[PDB]
Amino acid sequence: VFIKTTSLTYIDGENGILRYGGYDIEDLVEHTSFEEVVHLMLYGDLPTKLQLQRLKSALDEAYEVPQQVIDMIYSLPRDSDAVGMMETAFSALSSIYGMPWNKATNRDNAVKLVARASTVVANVLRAKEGKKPAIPEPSESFAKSFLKASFSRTPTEEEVKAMDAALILYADHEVPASTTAALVTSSTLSDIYSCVVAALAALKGPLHGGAAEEAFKQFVEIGEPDMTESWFKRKIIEGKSRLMGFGHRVYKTYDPRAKIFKKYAKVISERNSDARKYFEIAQKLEELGVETFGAKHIYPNTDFYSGVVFYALGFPVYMFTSLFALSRTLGWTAHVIEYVEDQHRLIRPRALYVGPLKRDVVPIELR
Amino acid sequence: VFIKTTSLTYIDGENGILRYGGYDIEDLVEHTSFEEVVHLMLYGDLPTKLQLQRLKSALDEAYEVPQQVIDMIYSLPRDSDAVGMMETAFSALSSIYGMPWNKATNRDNAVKLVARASTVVANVLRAKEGKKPAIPEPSESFAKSFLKASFSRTPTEEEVKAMDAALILYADHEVPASTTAALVTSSTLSDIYSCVVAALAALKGPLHGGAAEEAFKQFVEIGEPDMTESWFKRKIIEGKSRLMGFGHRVYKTYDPRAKIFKKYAKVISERNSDARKYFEIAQKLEELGVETFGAKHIYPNTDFYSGVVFYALGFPVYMFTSLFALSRTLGWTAHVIEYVEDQHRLIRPRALYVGPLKRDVVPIELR
């Protein structure tokens, strides 16, 4: 059931093609940047030099949020689900910054929102690690500012590029329950931050979030590359567990996102023996997996190497769905702007009554 | 489009009938209690004496939440929308208390949730008023515990009864965007508190929340009963403004809830000259309104006198939708339990691509 039209994202699952706004994902990753893709999704084209300068200034000025928002993150239990911590922070952002829908300013509000997602996700990691807070600051890119804030160290250029690619790769895809919850909430003209709140509330559910985690947890369980064949023979072949990070409801080929996350995984994993080990296990499972499942059109999906990237960057496994959400704030905001501006109606379905027929209240003594 | 089946609520809009679980609303209000209606909605029948005792103990033990939840409420700007403050508090409750879906414990989790809604709404009012926090404590009823916590004074029996009625009256009705957002979020097996978060995010939008406020604001604008005819002749007849709190998409008669909110309004308004004045204005507008619109099947709706009740109890106008939400946590939770247990599937609709055809990334110099 088509819930809306979109100009945002095109997917050809037979051919393994994904495009944003007519541009193929690989072309966007190699030759653009998350900032540029932000402009594409909100404004419908890649930006000129001047338009990009202005968008970058708008991002920069938005990073800072009130200290109350950070305090909230840091007052939650440190073992709380990171997506829930985001949910809470975005609720507070909605209460502080939420504005009515307005064509002249919707995209500007979305841009500020994406900046603030960066601040939120960095501080969720830092709260859960017991580190001091850090607010992103201007740098040569959104991906670098995010990494600097997350880790308190200047990242290398190859780390910057891999984060930038990950931001683009997960920006938008299909209409999952998170995007649906955002749409419902936008149907009442609740503010864009509250549309994201709803999306996160849905994301927290284990039938939606947790895919990049469950994939990478295979690798962790294997532990060492020379144990992969055994774990595969035991867990997948003999015990017919699903191989996580394989298979897709739309793609009948390699997910075009998978190949890309892999390329960046290979580059940034080689520095650290730990990240390299998991990259090496994942590569071996990829082979055993395609040898076993490829003839069935079951290939790596976007979630198979994304953990390997995030892990190589220095992110714990508990951050993986939050890092997905950081990226997907772009598609969430762009979908709700399209929906409100072009296709609005209040979402109010019906429930069919199948319950009891008329009966009278009996006094409680008689029950 | 029927999104689900339900055994919860029956509505006959031609005949002005509303029933929960086969019991007519008026019969439930006169002869039961919110606690009993909680049991009805979660378990499918009015409770015996023992079942009611156990439910009351479960409510009592749940009121207390961690101090971090109260601190969050109190760290938001005091002029923040009360429904947003609830959204934030419930996000924090989700992070602290959220559990997976489980048939043996779903209803117990819902009961604890409704108790905690009481704590949240009392402290939202108290934060916005600049008063010290108060946690509900056991008393002879949920309605009284809520009022004691909100106002730091023992309420009269007639005040208790009016609050109890209001809790029942707004418990469940149709499948508005708030209930829809809850359902979407439950589709991923996000926890029940996060299902409520989503519902609140949708409620915050002005096409959903704010109805009891906008109705009562008429009365405030009129100011004095002897000005009602004038305001009516000017604003409704000459300026064809909608009369708020009149009209309904389903009822072609008096909303069965309207008559009931009116009865309790009359009783508790008479004590205070201010509340009495607004009751007297509302009664006069009711008359002018039915004289003008009744032949068109446009009659008072549930939102016309509910503000008069809440105001008479001592609640500011900015609390009215939050007091609706307090009540509606019951229908929200009961709908999502029905949906998950009996009718589950992941909610994943589609978007039709109507955007640009294939194009190549141009270098930014060429843009």
Side-chain angles (χ1 to χ4, degrees):
Chain A
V1 48
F2 292 121
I3 181 153
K4 71 186 291 278
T5 53
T6 197
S7 291
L8 297 166
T9 300
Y10 179 74
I11 291 157
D12 180 348
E14 290 100 339
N15 294 308
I17 308 161
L18 171 66
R19 300 185 190 131
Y20 301 153
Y23 296 104
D24 275 290
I25 191 76
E26 198 194 347
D27 195 8
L28 296 170
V29 169
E30 178 68 12
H31 305 296
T32 78
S33 63
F34 184 57
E35 292 92 323
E36 290 168 275
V37 166
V38 168
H39 194 279
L40 173 65
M41 303 281 285
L42 296 176
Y43 296 96
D45 273 278
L46 292 165
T48 62
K49 292 245 202 203
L50 172 69
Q51 287 170 330
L52 185 54
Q53 183 232 77
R54 279 174 186 154
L55 177 67
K56 294 176 160 176
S57 302
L59 289 163
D60 285 344
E61 82 193 309
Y63 286 129
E64 181 182 331
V65 303
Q67 255 293 321
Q68 293 92 326
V69 173
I70 303 310
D71 292 343
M72 300 176 49
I73 289 175
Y74 276 86
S75 73
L76 296 168
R78 290 178 49 199
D79 69 337
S80 296
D81 190 277
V83 168
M85 300 175 66
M86 299 187 59
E87 182 199 67
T88 306
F90 266 86
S91 304
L93 297 169
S94 189
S95 290
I96 292 159
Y97 293 114
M99 291 290 279
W101 284 86
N102 180 51
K103 194 161 306 212
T105 58
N106 290 330
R107 298 160 182 75
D108 299 312
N109 294 160
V111 165
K112 291 191 278 191
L113 187 154
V114 170
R116 298 160 180 170
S118 179
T119 306
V120 170
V121 175
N123 286 286
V124 168
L125 160 71
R126 298 175 68 88
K128 290 179 66 62
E129 290 293 307
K131 309 187 162 154
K132 196 160 26 63
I135 302 283
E137 309 172 52
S139 81
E140 287 173 76
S141 68
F142 181 102
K144 178 166 175 181
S145 291
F146 175 56
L147 292 174
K148 285 186 66 185
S150 294
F151 303 123
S152 299
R153 85 191 164 82
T154 296
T156 69
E157 190 70 1
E158 292 85 8
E159 286 178 309
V160 169
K161 180 79 185 182
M163 186 66 235
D164 188 66
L167 290 171
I168 301 166
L169 290 170
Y170 275 147
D172 191 57
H173 212 265
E174 300 159 88
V175 189
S178 56
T179 309
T180 312
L183 292 163
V184 174
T185 299
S186 80
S187 90
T188 70
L189 305 181
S190 189
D191 59 84
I192 206 175
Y193 290 86
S194 279
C195 300
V196 172
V197 170
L200 292 163
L203 189 58
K204 196 189 177 187
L207 305 185
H208 184 18
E213 292 90 341
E214 292 298 279
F216 189 87
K217 284 179 186 173
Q218 291 168 142
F219 318 144
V220 172
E221 184 165 84
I222 292 158
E224 300 276 39
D226 292 349
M227 316 294 116
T228 315
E229 183 183 298
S230 178
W231 180 94
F232 191 89
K233 177 65 189 259
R234 298 173 77 256
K235 218 82 183 167
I236 304 210
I237 300 309
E238 288 310 313
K240 297 128 150 48
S241 216
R242 271 230 271 194
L243 180 53
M244 308 297 318
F246 264 66
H248 205 275
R249 268 173 63 73
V250 184
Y251 292 117
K252 283 128 171 61
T253 315
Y254 266 75
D255 181 333
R257 301 161 308 167
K259 321 177 217 217
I260 306 161
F261 268 115
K262 188 176 168 160
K263 175 183 193 282
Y264 289 100
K266 191 157 204 275
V267 179
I268 68 164
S269 293
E270 309 296 283
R271 281 185 102 202
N272 172 241
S273 42
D274 219 44
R276 186 165 184 161
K277 184 185 83 142
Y278 291 128
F279 178 67
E280 288 162 340
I281 286 144
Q283 267 229 97
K284 179 64 158 179
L285 266 183
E286 183 185 358
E287 177 193 330
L288 288 168
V290 173
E291 170 177 26
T292 312
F293 297 121
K296 311 192 191 301
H297 296 81
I298 292 159
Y299 285 100
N301 73 37
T302 187
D303 300 319
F304 195 83
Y305 285 102
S306 57
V308 186
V309 178
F310 297 142
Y311 195 90
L313 298 166
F315 292 102
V317 174
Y318 60 67
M319 290 303 291
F320 300 169
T321 295
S322 294
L323 292 159
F324 168 90
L326 177 54
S327 171
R328 182 56 55 96
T329 60
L330 179 63
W332 291 332
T333 59
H335 279 282
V336 293
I337 295 169
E338 268 192 329
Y339 186 78
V340 172
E341 289 186 5
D342 305 326
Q343 328 180 43
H344 179 264
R345 52 181 217 208
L346 193 70
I347 292 174
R348 43 179 159 190
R350 285 170 141 276
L352 183 58
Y353 190 67
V354 294
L357 300 189
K358 218 269 164 168
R359 40 183 186 164
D360 294 328
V361 169
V362 157
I364 187 170
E365 304 74 355
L366 265 30
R367 296 178 200 151
Chain B
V1 48
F2 292 121
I3 181 153
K4 71 186 291 278
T5 53
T6 197
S7 291
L8 297 166
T9 300
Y10 179 74
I11 291 157
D12 180 348
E14 290 100 339
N15 294 308
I17 308 161
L18 171 66
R19 300 185 190 131
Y20 301 153
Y23 296 104
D24 275 290
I25 191 76
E26 198 194 347
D27 195 8
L28 296 170
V29 169
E30 178 68 12
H31 305 296
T32 78
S33 63
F34 184 57
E35 292 92 323
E36 290 168 275
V37 166
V38 168
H39 194 279
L40 173 65
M41 303 281 285
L42 296 176
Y43 296 96
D45 273 278
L46 292 165
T48 62
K49 292 245 202 203
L50 172 69
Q51 287 170 330
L52 185 54
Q53 183 232 77
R54 279 174 186 154
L55 177 67
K56 294 176 160 176
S57 302
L59 289 163
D60 285 344
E61 82 193 309
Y63 286 129
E64 181 182 331
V65 303
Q67 255 293 321
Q68 293 92 326
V69 173
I70 303 310
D71 292 343
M72 300 176 49
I73 289 175
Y74 276 86
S75 73
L76 296 168
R78 290 178 49 199
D79 69 337
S80 296
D81 190 277
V83 168
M85 300 175 66
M86 299 187 59
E87 182 199 67
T88 306
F90 266 86
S91 304
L93 297 169
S94 189
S95 290
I96 292 159
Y97 293 114
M99 291 290 279
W101 284 86
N102 180 51
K103 194 161 306 212
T105 58
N106 290 330
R107 298 160 182 75
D108 299 312
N109 294 160
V111 165
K112 291 191 278 191
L113 187 154
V114 170
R116 298 160 180 170
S118 179
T119 306
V120 170
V121 175
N123 286 286
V124 168
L125 160 71
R126 298 175 68 88
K128 290 179 66 62
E129 290 293 307
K131 309 187 162 154
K132 196 160 26 63
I135 302 283
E137 309 172 52
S139 81
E140 287 173 76
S141 68
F142 181 102
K144 178 166 175 181
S145 291
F146 175 56
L147 292 174
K148 285 186 66 185
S150 294
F151 303 123
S152 299
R153 85 191 164 82
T154 296
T156 69
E157 190 70 1
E158 292 85 8
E159 286 178 309
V160 169
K161 180 79 185 182
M163 186 66 235
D164 188 66
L167 290 171
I168 301 166
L169 290 170
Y170 275 147
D172 191 57
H173 212 265
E174 300 159 88
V175 189
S178 56
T179 309
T180 312
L183 292 163
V184 174
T185 299
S186 80
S187 90
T188 70
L189 305 181
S190 189
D191 59 84
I192 206 175
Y193 290 86
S194 279
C195 300
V196 172
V197 170
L200 292 163
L203 189 58
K204 196 189 177 187
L207 305 185
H208 184 18
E213 292 90 341
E214 292 298 279
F216 189 87
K217 284 179 186 173
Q218 291 168 142
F219 318 144
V220 172
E221 184 165 84
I222 292 158
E224 300 276 39
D226 292 349
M227 316 294 116
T228 315
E229 183 183 298
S230 178
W231 180 94
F232 191 89
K233 177 65 189 259
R234 298 173 77 256
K235 218 82 183 167
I236 304 210
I237 300 309
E238 288 310 313
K240 297 128 150 48
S241 216
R242 271 230 271 194
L243 180 53
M244 308 297 318
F246 264 66
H248 205 275
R249 268 173 63 73
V250 184
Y251 292 117
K252 283 128 171 61
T253 315
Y254 266 75
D255 181 333
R257 301 161 308 167
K259 321 177 217 217
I260 306 161
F261 268 115
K262 188 176 168 160
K263 175 183 193 282
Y264 289 100
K266 191 157 204 275
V267 179
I268 68 164
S269 293
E270 309 296 283
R271 281 185 102 202
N272 172 241
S273 42
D274 219 44
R276 186 165 184 161
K277 184 185 83 142
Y278 291 128
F279 178 67
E280 288 162 340
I281 286 144
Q283 267 229 97
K284 179 64 158 179
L285 266 183
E286 183 185 358
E287 177 193 330
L288 288 168
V290 173
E291 170 177 26
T292 312
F293 297 121
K296 311 192 191 301
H297 296 81
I298 292 159
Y299 285 100
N301 73 37
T302 187
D303 300 319
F304 195 83
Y305 285 102
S306 57
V308 186
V309 178
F310 297 142
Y311 195 90
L313 298 166
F315 292 102
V317 174
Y318 60 67
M319 290 303 291
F320 300 169
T321 295
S322 294
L323 292 159
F324 168 90
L326 177 54
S327 171
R328 182 56 55 96
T329 60
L330 179 63
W332 291 332
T333 59
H335 279 282
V336 293
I337 295 169
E338 268 192 329
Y339 186 78
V340 172
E341 289 186 5
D342 305 326
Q343 328 180 43
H344 179 264
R345 52 181 217 208
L346 193 70
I347 292 174
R348 43 179 159 190
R350 285 170 141 276
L352 183 58
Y353 190 67
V354 294
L357 300 189
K358 218 269 164 168
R359 40 183 186 164
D360 294 328
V361 169
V362 157
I364 187 170
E365 304 74 355
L366 265 30
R367 296 178 200 151

